[PDB]
Amino acid sequence: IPRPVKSSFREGLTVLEYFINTHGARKGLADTALRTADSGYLTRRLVDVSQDVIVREHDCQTERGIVVELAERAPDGTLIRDPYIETSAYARTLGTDAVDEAGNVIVERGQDLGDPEIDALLAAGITQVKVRSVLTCATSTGVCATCYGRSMATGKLVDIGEAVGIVAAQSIGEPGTQLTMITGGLPRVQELFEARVPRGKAPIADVTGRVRLEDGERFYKITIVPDDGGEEVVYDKISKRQRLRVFKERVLSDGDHVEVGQQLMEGSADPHEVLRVQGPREVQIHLVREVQEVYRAQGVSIHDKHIEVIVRQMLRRVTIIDSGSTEFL
Amino acid sequence: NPLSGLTHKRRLSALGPGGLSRERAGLEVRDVHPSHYGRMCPIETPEGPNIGLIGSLSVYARVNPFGFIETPYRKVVDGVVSDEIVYLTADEEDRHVVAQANSPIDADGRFVEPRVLVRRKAGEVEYVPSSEVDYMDVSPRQMVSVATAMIPFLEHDDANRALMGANMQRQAVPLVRSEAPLVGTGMELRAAIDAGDVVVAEESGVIEEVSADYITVMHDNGTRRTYRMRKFARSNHGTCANQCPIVDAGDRVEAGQVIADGPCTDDGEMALGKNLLVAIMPWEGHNYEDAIILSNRLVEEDVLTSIHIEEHEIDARDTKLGAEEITRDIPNISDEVLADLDERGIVRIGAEVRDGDILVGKVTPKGETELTPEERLLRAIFGEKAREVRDTSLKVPHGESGKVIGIRVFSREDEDELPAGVNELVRVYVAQKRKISDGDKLAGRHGNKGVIGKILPVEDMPFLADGTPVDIILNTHGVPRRMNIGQILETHLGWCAHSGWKVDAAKGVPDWAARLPDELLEAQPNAIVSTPVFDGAQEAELQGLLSCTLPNRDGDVLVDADGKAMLFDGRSGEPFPYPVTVGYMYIMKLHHLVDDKIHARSTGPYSMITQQPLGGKAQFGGQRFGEMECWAMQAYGAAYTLQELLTIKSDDTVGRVKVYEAIVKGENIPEPGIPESFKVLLKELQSLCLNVEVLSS
Amino acid sequence: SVPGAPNRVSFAKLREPLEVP
Amino acid sequence: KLHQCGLPKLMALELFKPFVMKRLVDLNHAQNIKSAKRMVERQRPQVWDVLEEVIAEHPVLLNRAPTLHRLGIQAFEPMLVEGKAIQLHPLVCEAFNADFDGDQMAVHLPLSAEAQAEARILMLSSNNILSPASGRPLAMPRLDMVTGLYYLTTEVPGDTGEYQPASGDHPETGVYSSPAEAIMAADRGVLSVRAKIKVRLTQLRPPVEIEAELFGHSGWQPGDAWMAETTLGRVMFNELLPLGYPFVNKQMHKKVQAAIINDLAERYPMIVVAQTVDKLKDAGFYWATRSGVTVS
Amino acid sequence: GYDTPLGITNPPIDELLDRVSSKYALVIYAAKRARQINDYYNQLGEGILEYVGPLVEPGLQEKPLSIALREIHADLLEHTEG
Amino acid sequence: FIEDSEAVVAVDAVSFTLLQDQLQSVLDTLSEREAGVVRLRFGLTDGQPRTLDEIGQVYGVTRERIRQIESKTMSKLRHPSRSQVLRDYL
Amino acid sequence: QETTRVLTDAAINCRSDKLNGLKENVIIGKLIPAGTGINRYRNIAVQPTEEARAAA
Amino acid sequence: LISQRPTLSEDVLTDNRSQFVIEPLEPGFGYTLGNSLRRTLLSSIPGAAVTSIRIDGVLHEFTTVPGVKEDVTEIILNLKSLVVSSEEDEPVTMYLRKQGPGEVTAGDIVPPAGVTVHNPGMHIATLNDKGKLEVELVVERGRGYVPAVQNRASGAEIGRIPVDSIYSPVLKVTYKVDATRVEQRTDFDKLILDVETKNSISPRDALASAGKTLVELFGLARELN
Amino acid sequence: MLISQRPTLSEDVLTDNRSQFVIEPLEPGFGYTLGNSLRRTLLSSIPGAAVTSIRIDGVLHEFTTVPGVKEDVTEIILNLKSLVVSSEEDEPVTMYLRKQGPGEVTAGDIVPPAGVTVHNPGMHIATLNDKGKLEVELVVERGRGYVPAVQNRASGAEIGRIPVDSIYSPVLKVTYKVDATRVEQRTDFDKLILDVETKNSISPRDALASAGKTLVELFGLARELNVEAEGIEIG
RNA sequence: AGCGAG
Ligand SMILES: [Mg+2]
Ligand SMILES: [Zn+2]
């Protein structure tokens, strides 16, 4: 309302200012009830999906791991600590030994990677490190203690019976009811975990090429002519309301070289397409990043490993294309 | 209380037969619409899953013959405000450019300024076409209801806190005494009068004879009329409904004059709580997170105390074996617990009874059954007989106590209408004087609720330099962020009203008191005052009245112009290093007393189709251990406690008596079995033609 | 207004045209 | 204390009555089980001491619906209180999200040996300090206690009893020989608790820089003495933390207190964390009472 | 460097965890020992059975679980995991 | 909201168990023949009560002797000595 | 969720539940296979150490 | 060293309110001593008060007597403001009989020997032509506040109406210390204890009784030696 | 009215001069009444002695450093200010601390005149350097409490004479804690716990006993007002 | 149905 309420609560609001004020307060009190309901339902779903994720072994010895960026190299040359590092790299186990300028090991595999470890890594001048995560856990039933990493509550390595799935579900779903609901709050997390096609279905490139962009009426065409030179694909009646994305500083410019995933239109990209285009690892990264972005936007900190547990539970099945000859539809 | 009944009337519920249901009701009907102004309160509304579906009719609102809600407005003609009050419905208001109540008038009927604030058809409050506005609000507070019109300094409270204060004024219990607030509004008296729980003389006359049970008044012409008070009657919610006269034996009383105040009324004006000397400091972590610490004076002088009357009903019926008798011959029970019971059964009036005592001695027939060999041997050894009649006596349910006000006995033999197949029906009224104790819920009128964490002795209570201990201590951490600064304002004004003031008009009136109404420049100590909802005591006027606060007994102002007093520590003895905001806050005792909230269980009734004992304090109820709690237990990794809970504490009907035996005999708690609910589920599935079988391996 | 009432003095600066219904 | 919860006498007697009947039969206050049940149902004066003997070190789980996370069920060692209300520790409030404006809560009683062991070890409230979600402490002081500690440890220049190095006419006349002398001066209207001074400290470990300068290698602080240019309030606060923790000497914002508790949990055992947290709560409440924060 | 642990928090759980592999192992260890001690106290006045204990001077009114834990603290027991 | 009024109440169950235990003990106090006669009179041993004639037949004694010893047994068990160990159960 | 659909399909498929998760074990009232209920902690064998038995 | 012991002096202002000046104290001792005296006075001064009343034509405090303008509960409240001083520990019974129109005050009550009503003008009830009020009150000695003893516990009939008893005869106690604080550091404290009692005992006697109790207690801290 | 419970005072000993007295069960609220009294009394009633001024030769205008010692003026002051001294004299008595030669100057190196005893004979006051000589004149009085340093009003009096804060009180730090015992069976009686730390001049228990005496005096004045008056007597 | 806590 552009009036506005031009008075303080010490000065005392006039009659009309108080009436105008009451609208938002009543709206918030109804929204809070509906939001607690939605968050409870989401927590129930998250608990039920990941019941069977509990620590079973101590170690897989799996080589597979996930890369975490830590600080970012400054253009002038310097390592500035990544802002969201406390929830990404801390309380994780190194999968591969760290190497500084092709030198000795600052910290080898199988370390809790606590605050002194991060300090040492930033001092050395190394940014990307491979840690062990539940996503790349070789054990079949549940996960293992080392790949899961440190228990946040206990502060040490997780036990061999911890129901990390329930803890992850509760940790993700408790800060809901404080997430003030493209979709950007609790609905966004709900449609991210449900893997639903988003409302703002912003298509992403399929093959590296040049974006032959047009200006249409009631639509656009983000065409792309590849560098594979193969069979350039075009995009459908991409609506005019959706504004173009800011690709790296320069917005998407007609005839511009894009990579395999660079989001072309503003908003979200449905996880299924990015999965089909970039394999399971990139969809994992996309899901964790989007959920953590939603939770950070309000000011809530959840460690990445819980969202990783849920994401792991989401990517465990395969569609059958060819039966072969074994009872597979 | 009278306010709760009054606001149950004037309540508009958007749900019921042929109306929106909470589930099917969307989110756009719960919001506030611009058309609600003057027709429905935007503040007073339930805070649960009913916000917006239930509201309260505004003070001046009226109902069109067609069912629409009209609101009054002053017809302003040619820029000239008038007195003609037209009642407009929402439609007609939209077509007219309606002004606002607090628009200064030049005393000629005309607006003394251009740019007069206004509303328009679309509900948009915006800039204004000066002159040629067709209507004006009748008065401020037109948009608030009766409950919200009794919150002083409402304009200084956020809508959430005002809403909670409005909803919490209706929960105040009737205290024994009741005191009219020092700081109130103009709605107190009218609310009490129109609530109907306060006696008003029908016609003028001279009080002929007044006593504690009736008032006989001689009218101006011969005839005389007797109003009969309602002494210590029980309300629907268990509170007291005492009425006492407030007129002498010779006073002349005019028609419509209050002559006997009701439960929550003082001299005819509503009084829901008590004025308490309050400090707004944090104190030793006992008033932590909206908790309240009260002096023991409030329990000694008995100022926060409520009479609660509870009715117990028992009816002797006609059964197959015969009929139930009400007499003092209860089987097998001794001559001690048959002591108070009258010659005819039911307990005597004025007999103190504690939980478990017998109120009505009833005895229903049992019919022949099979006494066990052990019990037959014991009866022979102790020489008794089965009596063939069981007991079904009425007893003071668990956790209750009190005197016995009166017994009401209905009987068929005396030809009193009773349901079919019942011979007698006796109701016993048990009254207890509840004193405020920790766990009880208190609140002011500004949504500043809280349970009582502690009740300090008066000696370890902060006391002003004069020596007066403070009665209550609220926390300063709850004011700034909940945005209900109004309470602080009230506090300051309360103190001023308690002390009295004199504006020093030696050389004219002070600039801050120029617009003060006459005769407010001087107020004697303990002077009741009113600050109407949206016109009231401006902050400058409050500052001024706080500066002049004529001294208590000697020349000593205990509260500086800032409103803060230098308090002495009750325990240490040293003064607190900095002044403390001290005043008089009018706080109510909400009807959420801990005596009705406490509950415990070790074993009791079990539900019919399933075990998992009945829920509810009314029964002997176990506390629900839901799925969220079970997930929390699973996350802890505590498998054994969860299995114990869900098997032997709740459902397993064989391991239950076994765990009781083990506990009583010192043995180990036994292994739990299959919960009964699982076998119930298996039978339900099978009866759905689903062959479910539990394969051994 | 009401014949016999406590004398509660008001800080009200605006006269009310309509008595409460 | 962080591992305790008040339990109303009536509620405890009803919850434990299977146990109290046994105990008051064994003590011979009752002849048999039915007589004992009768005494319990009439709450005879002698069945309260037996109750205190039964309830001893027998944990009870406390729950507040909704249980949005794991730390919404926590086991406490129950203590008997006078009337009808469960006395909750202030620190576990944020874990339960429980403020005292009518927030009822439920009490469950573990029975078997495994249940008692789980309640005592896994769920004990003093064992659950850090949030399982992010690891940040959940039992750290908040609201009144943070205000008290911030008021205590904040420094105000120009305060009474401050330190002035002026020479030519008199010495610095601001230095104190021990915290005992500092507190004695505080009792007199001389030294404020928030005044920069220099004091001789001999029981609190100095920070890393001054330790590495004056000691260097193996500074054994329990006996050695050093000069701390700080306020008295910071000394009093640093006396609450364990002996090994070096001097902080910082105004204690919420973030700083949370970081201190994080570091303490990471380095020290969780019992030390619980005791330090409890002492912090006590000091915070005391100095929140003394802070004089109020609204007008 | 603690101070006298009082009540249910005695002995400290950390210095018990030093005796086992995890909190769950400690839970089962103490629970089974407590069951053994209760069985001893019950089935001893009757024909002498086998389960032994306590190994530490019990308090005048002290529950079997606390005795079991005080035994664990003194490294007075042994256990084998499945 | 309806209570099963025919469920093992779990307190009368333990009460009955202890009643049977203490009754068995106090019976073991008196002479063996006395115990036998009262037992088989009320059918405590196996739940089948019989009259004087049956017990007389099984022990090969006339009905009247069983009646007499039964009277003596009741008189003994009624003594205050063996009643305070059995009251509070009736 | 969707109890009727789930049970219809399970009945048609002759699906056997191995009772291995946490919800199934909770439903049938037996120890959940997590935390203290797993097979390595549940059947810990506890006995006095030999020196303690000798002392006592 | 101070080299001077303390002394006390009374300043009788009213027959109830008086200033006790104690000087010279030690720097800092003023507030501590004054608060100790106040906490003893306000809580632990023995006195007497009505412990249970019985009206002839009443069965409990939730009824009304015919002819009185006040309820039974209102009568209880009016009697709560009664100040009486007794001289013997054992329970004493006094009577209050009035008939016909009139203002039933405390002065109507007839106190036996030893017990005395120090506010005869206090109002208890107002009667009319049809009213008769006959109530017997019980007074005993004690200290502090004791909740109304229940009827069943102590052998009693269905007529007794237990009343809460507030035995302490002290209204208001404050204290103001006047420190000297000279730069030569020969400072001292002077405590001015204002004490106001409710006409049952002069402030002097209340202060003396507080002295008795506190001396007894601190004697224990002395006997350790 | 004859209190029904007898208070009992016991003590635990932690170090040479440091103790934890416990008084229980006090009536429902007598913990604080006398806990604060005993704190403020134990710390300022017990007659003690302390150095009230010092004179360091060569320190007359600049009070920064002394030639012939490592420690500066402040550290000599602080070390001296923590010197436990018992003076049975009446008026101020001066003392002389003279040491020339490389080595550490301890309290035992002072010459106590008759009437004064130094119960800390092994503390470090200073360390001489460069064949220096330390010739300090102390002034010991006796008082009660932490009298802050008195400024030398007279200019010519002794420009060298450094007024030093005087910890006359023999007790150094006392802290009381009133816990509540027996909520139900006793109606929440309270026990008070006094943690006492005192310098070597006097043992904590004797400090407490002298406290008890001096408190008896004041409340005995109160009693003297009316000797025969009802009072809750421990019996 | 009204109502409380979140
Ligand atoms: Mg709440
Ligand atoms: Zn792994």
Side-chain angles (χ1 to χ4, degrees), chain B residues 124-125 127-313:
Chain B
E124 77 293 24
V125 57
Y127 202 63
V128 307
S130 310
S131 174
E132 274 288 4
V133 303
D134 274 3
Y135 288 113
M136 161 192 182
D137 271 13
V138 70
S139 96
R141 97 182 161 180
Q142 207 187 26
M143 50 148 277
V144 301
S145 59
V146 58
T148 307
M150 297 183 27
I151 303 172
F153 303 107
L154 181 63
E155 63 272 41
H156 305 116
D157 287 352
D158 213 301
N160 301 310
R161 315 309 302 185
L163 173 149
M164 276 165 33
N167 292 295
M168 272 195 318
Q169 292 212 62
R170 313 194 276 89
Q171 280 160 38
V173 304
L175 278 56
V176 179
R177 282 275 77 179
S178 320
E179 294 183 343
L182 270 74
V183 181
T185 51
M187 207 53 40
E188 321 276 359
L189 179 58
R190 293 301 326 287
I193 270 176
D194 283 321
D197 280 347
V198 62
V199 187
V200 294
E202 288 165 17
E203 199 245 322
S204 297
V206 53
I207 305 299
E208 154 165 55
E209 145 170 337
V210 64
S211 85
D213 216 302
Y214 60 104
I215 322 165
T216 303
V217 306
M218 250 301 303
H219 301 345
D220 282 331
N221 55 351
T223 173
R224 92 187 44 199
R225 193 219 197 286
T226 175
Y227 308 84
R228 163 140 275 105
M229 316 287 107
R230 206 149 39 80
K231 310 304 295 187
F232 285 100
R234 184 187 169 272
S235 80
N236 296 325
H237 283 56
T239 54
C240 197
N242 189 27
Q243 288 183 328
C244 48
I246 65 166
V247 309
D248 297 330
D251 297 335
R252 273 215 74 259
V253 291
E254 309 88 342
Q257 186 189 125
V258 184
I259 80 189
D261 65 16
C264 287
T265 325
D266 172 348
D267 210 317
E269 80 197 309
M270 181 81 76
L272 290 169
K274 294 291 179 63
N275 315 267
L276 307 185
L277 178 45
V278 53
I280 308 290
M281 76 171 130
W283 198 89
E284 302 283 346
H286 283 123
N287 58 311
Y288 181 72
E289 286 221 72
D290 324 284
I292 302 187
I293 48 184
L294 315 169
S295 173
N296 202 24
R297 206 274 301 180
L298 301 162
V299 185
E300 266 167 39
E301 270 263 12
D302 203 31
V303 297
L304 290 176
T305 275
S306 60
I307 308 302
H308 287 261
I309 308 174
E310 172 73 27
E311 145 168 299
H312 310 122
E313 190 162 75

Side-chain angles (χ1 to χ4, degrees), chain D residues 167-180:
Chain D
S167 300
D169 40 18
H170 58 80
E172 309 100 322
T173 175
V175 56
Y176 294 103
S177 72
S178 294

Side-chain angles (χ1 to χ4, degrees), chain A residues 190-239 242-304:
Chain A
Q190 172 168 322
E191 68 159 1
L192 266 162
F193 282 127
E194 288 299 335
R196 304 214 207 78
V197 296
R199 313 193 151 71
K201 172 59 178 132
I204 72 193
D206 198 358
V207 160
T208 49
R210 300 295 166 292
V211 55
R212 206 294 317 188
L213 181 49
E214 70 164 63
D215 283 6
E217 290 78 3
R218 208 186 81 249
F219 43 61
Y220 292 122
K221 305 297 160 297
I222 320 160
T223 318
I224 296 185
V225 185
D227 298 356
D228 216 311
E231 193 184 1
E232 42 265 49
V233 201
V234 198
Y235 286 177
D236 62 0
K237 296 302 196 308
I238 305 293
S239 68
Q242 301 199 241
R243 61 164 153 269
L244 275 155
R245 272 260 292 189
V246 155
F247 163 60
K248 317 310 127 195
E249 54 303 0
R250 315 169 303 89
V251 306
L252 182 141
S253 312
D254 189 356
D256 190 359
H257 174 240
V258 290
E259 301 275 2
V260 294
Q262 180 38 57
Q263 195 186 300
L264 305 185
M265 255 306 147
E266 196 80 8
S268 43
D270 72 317
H272 302 263
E273 158 167 42
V274 54
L275 168 44
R276 172 265 311 284
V277 175
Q278 294 177 342
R281 175 50 191 168
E282 262 317 306
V283 57
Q284 280 172 18
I285 279 172
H286 172 291
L287 279 159
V288 177
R289 206 200 65 241
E290 286 303 293
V291 174
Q292 275 284 66
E293 185 146 7
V294 156
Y295 275 103
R296 292 159 186 168
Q298 261 77 35
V300 163
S301 48
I302 307 152
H303 204 284
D304 270 25

Side-chain angles (χ1 to χ4, degrees), chain D residues 165-199:
Chain D
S167 300
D169 40 18
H170 58 80
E172 309 100 322
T173 175
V175 56
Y176 294 103
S177 72
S178 294
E181 198 188 331
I183 305 145
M184 278 204 202
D187 281 1
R188 289 275 283 268
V190 182
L191 160 87
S192 181
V193 192
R194 305 161 67 190
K196 205 168 85 181
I197 58 177
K198 102 167 69 170
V199 56

Side-chain angles (χ1 to χ4, degrees), chain E:
Chain E
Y2 46 84
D3 293 8
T4 279
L6 88 161
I8 208 172
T9 192
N10 168 24
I13 61 156
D14 73 335
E15 141 167 28
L16 297 169
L17 308 200
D18 170 89
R19 273 71 169 154
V20 302
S21 62
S22 45
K23 297 175 78 173
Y24 309 122
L26 178 51
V27 154
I28 296 287
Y29 188 25
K32 277 211 214 195
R33 175 51 178 180
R35 276 181 182 272
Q36 285 186 34
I37 283 163
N38 205 1
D39 269 12
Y40 161 83
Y41 277 128
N42 289 310
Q43 328 192 102
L44 171 85
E46 308 296 68
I48 306 293
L49 287 210
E50 303 163 60
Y51 278 177
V52 86
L55 296 162
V56 291
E57 271 315 330
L60 194 148
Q61 317 103 309
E62 144 171 325
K63 310 271 177 311
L65 182 45
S66 178
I67 299 162
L69 276 158
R70 218 148 44 79
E71 265 170 359
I72 309 298
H73 177 210
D75 293 359
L76 265 180
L77 270 72
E78 73 168 271
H79 70 312
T80 76
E81 300 181 354

Side-chain angles (χ1 to χ4, degrees), chain I residues 149-152 154-157 159-160 162-183 185-199:
Chain I
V150 60
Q151 293 134 32
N152 44 219
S155 63
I159 191 62
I162 299 173
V164 86
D165 298 302
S166 307
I167 319 172
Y168 296 111
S169 174
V171 186
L172 279 171
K173 182 196 142 291
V174 172
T175 44
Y176 75 103
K177 175 94 189 83
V178 182
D179 321 270
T181 80
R182 301 318 304 129
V183 294
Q185 180 264 316
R186 269 181 255 288
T187 70
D188 217 20
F189 285 6
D190 43 7
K191 65 169 182 179
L192 77 98
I193 307 172
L194 293 164
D195 177 343
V196 171
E197 306 183 356
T198 180
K199 59 182 68 180

